[PDB]
């Protein structure tokens, strides 16, 4: 369906295969966009379920069960791109041995797109596709989210690394309570509280814990991609949009008359370009799709009728992830809102 994403992914694993993970190493913007594109094209490989094997609860088994993973053209093309050099490199990686950046990225992305957990068990077994047991399916999906994040955090703890983060795609958060996964992953692992370990993942899960997935009457804007939908009541940092797999070019619907700044691309003079929208209804970005080295995904909510506790998520230096890994900020103790003279308005 999309071979360009696979080619870019392969080239980036070859480039980063020998790059050791240091204390402040972070995924470059280009690599992050490559990961984003590969995940979203894996999702687009199968746009709808088969009516003969549809899950009555509505869970997206098309990206969870092996019955549909093995039918995805994208998965087969990526595992057999150029005689499967990536697949051969994958069959030797393990949570407890990854030391390089390329290994980290390859293992996480291949586990995700193969419908596999880190311990080898599938996300959802082929016999539970047409199941009605809500608790079992929900627990399986919740375990998939928790295990992806926990695997990333255990890597970061072993390598003593900060700012590495890939994120769990939105489809894995089906009936998943963000607060429950956040507390399960941070009250059972005391070593994860260190201020030098996985702060991007910390910010991702903290935001997903304070903000629920579905806010009925407290939503300000909605994302939908392939029907998988999310609602936000706060400024949406780029790490959240990148972890969930939502682009600013997807369908955004706007429920109030607030002003949003949709950051779109990085321009010259070390700035960012944004669009402003105020009307209720759909939000349409008429600009061309940016390249992987300058793509940006973030939304700022101007509203002032909100708690001051979560206003730092809209700060420019936190909403937009820094190119320099050491300048990235993930908490209110380091958030700062400076340097708007470099930004420009498109529309």
């Amino acid at each position: 369906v999309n071979v360009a994403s696979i080619t870019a992914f392969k080239s980036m694993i070859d480039e980063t295969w020998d790059k050791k993970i240091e204390a402040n190493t972070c995924i470059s913007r280009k690599h992050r966009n490559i990961i984003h594109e590969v995940i979203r094209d894996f999702m687009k490989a199968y746009p709808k379920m088969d009516e003969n094997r549809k899950s009555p609860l509505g869970a997206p088994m098309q990206w969870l069960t092996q019955y549909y993973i093995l039918k995805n053209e994208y998965h087969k093309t990526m595992l057999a791109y150029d005689d499967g050099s990536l697949n051969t490199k994958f069959k030797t990686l393990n949570i407890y041995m990854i030391t390089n950046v390329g290994q980290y990225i390859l293992y996480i992305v291949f586990c995700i797109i193969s419908g596999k957990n880190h311990d080898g068990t599938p996300y959802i077994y082929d016999s539970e596709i047409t199941s009605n047991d809500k608790n079992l399916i929900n627990d399986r999906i919740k375990y998939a989210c928790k295990q992806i994040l926990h695997g990333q955090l255990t890597m970061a703890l072993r390598i003593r690394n900060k700012f590495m983060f890939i994120g769990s795609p939105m489809y894995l958060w089906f009936n998943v309570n963000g607060s429950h996964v956040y507390h399960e992953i941070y009250d059972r692992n005391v070593g994860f509280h260190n201020k030098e370990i996985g702060r991007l993942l910390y910010a991702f899960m903290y935001y997903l814990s304070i903000s629920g997935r579905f806010l009925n009457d407290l939503a300000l804007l909605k994302f939908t991609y392939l029907g998988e939908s999310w609602t936000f009541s706060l400024s949406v940092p780029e790490y959240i949009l990148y972890g969930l797999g939502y682009s600013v070019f997807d369908t955004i619907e706007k429920f109030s008359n607030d002003a949003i700044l949709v950051y779109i691309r990085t321009n010259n003079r070390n700035g960012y370009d944004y669009a402003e929208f105020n009307k209720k209804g759909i939000v349409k970005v008429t600009e061309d799709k940016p390249d992987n080295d300058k793509r940006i995904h973030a939304i700022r909510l101007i509203n002032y009728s909100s708690d001051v506790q979560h206003i730092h998520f809209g700060f420019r230096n936190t909403l937009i992830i820094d190119n320099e890994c050491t300048s990235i900020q993930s908490s209110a103790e380091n958030a700062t809102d400076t340097g708007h003279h470099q930004d420009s308005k498109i529309n």
Partner: antibody
Amino acid sequence: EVQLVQSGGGVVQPGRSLRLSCAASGFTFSSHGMHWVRQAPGKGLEWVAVISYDGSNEHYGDSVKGRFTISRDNSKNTLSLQMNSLRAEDTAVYYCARPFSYGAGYYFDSWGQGALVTVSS
Amino acid sequence: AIQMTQSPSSLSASVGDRVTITCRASQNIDSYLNWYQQKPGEAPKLLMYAASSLQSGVPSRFSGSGSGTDFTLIISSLQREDFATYYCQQSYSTPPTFGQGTKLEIK
């Protein structure tokens, strides 16, 4: 040195219940999943069950589905298998096998000594 | 699940002979096959952790081949310590079927 020790084998009448245990040592038990495999006397190996590193995900073989429950206690490093509706078909030596993951697959790198369960009267 | 079938069920070979235990899969397992050796009265030991992939401490005489739906384990020179049962286990999809073992007997 990874080492898995098992206990709770013995005799139980058909239809009754038994509880196997497998105390792990020498590795971070809280991070690795665990599997159970049985071997009927003189027959091939058969997969029984799996439990995730925390205990929120588990699966059982088709033949044993609905009669066993696998649990783990990450504070004591204990892996237990609950036996119900025991048939004569279930007489076997039971091993707890720790999986070592490579790629999307895995292989059993550590096996227990084997606890014999005999369903006979 | 994916069924595992080995051939032959039993094999007779002398010291220094060549043996080829073949494992077939019902569906594609994509190089996810592990071979175990079990001496009588002992737990299985891993020999190859993937198709044509060896484990630490395994003698180099053991060798592997296969690319899904067909795999082979070859012992170039059978020493007296290599007379045991061999199981082919797929790990592409849980349940990990173990396959009917092959027993090697001295001739």
